[PDB]
Amino acid sequence: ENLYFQGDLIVSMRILGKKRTKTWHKGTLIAIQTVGPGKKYKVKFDNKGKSLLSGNHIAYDYHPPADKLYVGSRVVAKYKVWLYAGIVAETPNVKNKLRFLIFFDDGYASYVTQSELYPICRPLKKTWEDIEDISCRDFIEEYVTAYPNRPMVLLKSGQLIKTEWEGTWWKSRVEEVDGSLVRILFLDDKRCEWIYRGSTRLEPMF
Ligand SMILES: CC(=O)NCc1ccccc1-n1c(C)nnc1C
Description:
It is found in: Nucleus; Cytoplasm; Chromosome. Helices cover 6% and strands 47% of the residues. By secondary structure, it is mainly β. Strand 2 (5-6) and strand 3 form a beta hairpin. It starts with a strand and ends with a strand. Ligand BWM binds next to helix 1 and strand 17.
C-alpha cells in the first residue's frame, strides 16, 4: 500500500537519507510504501537522485533534544563536513564537558554537540544490528549492553605504550586525554589518532 502518514512521518517532509556512498544527504520524503509488514521510504535528494530506503536509513532533519538520546541511540553526526551514521556512546556529563561521544560505523570516535546530531527515524530494536562490519558490530553490542560497566585504561600524557594498528603492535606515546578518548602518537610515522580508552588496541603493560 502507498501511505501518506506513518507514525510521525508525512509525505513531503524534509528528511535526511543515506546514499550508497554511506554519507547522508538532505531530501524530501516523496512516498511511503508497505511491503507486507515491512515499510520503505522514497526520498528525492536535493541534488542528485531518488532512493527507496529502509526506515533505519532515513533521519529527521532536526537536532534531537538531549532527553531523547540514550547510550545506544542511532544517529547521524557531522564527521570531519560529511554526515555519517553512528551510535551514542556517552551523553553529556561533567566529566565529558557536556558533549556526546559518538562511535561512527567505520570505528572513528569523536565528541560532538547536539547541533551536530540528527536522529535516525526508525532504528532497529538492537540499534547496532545495521553496522556492516561484524568486528565493529560486536564491539558496539558489548559496549552498549554492558554500559555503565566500562573498563578503561588510565593513561597520562607522555606515557609510552604499545598501540595496535593493522594487526601489529606499534610503539606510541600518549599525547593528550579528553574524557574517554586518548590522542596517541605512533612513533614510527609521527601521526596521531584519537582512541577510546576502553579499546583493546591499547597496551600500557609490556
Ligand atoms: C577510535 C575508537 O576507539 N573507536 C571505538 C570503536 C567503535 C566501533 C568499532 C571499533 C572501535 N575501536 C577502534 C577503531 N579502535 N578501538 C576500538 C574499540
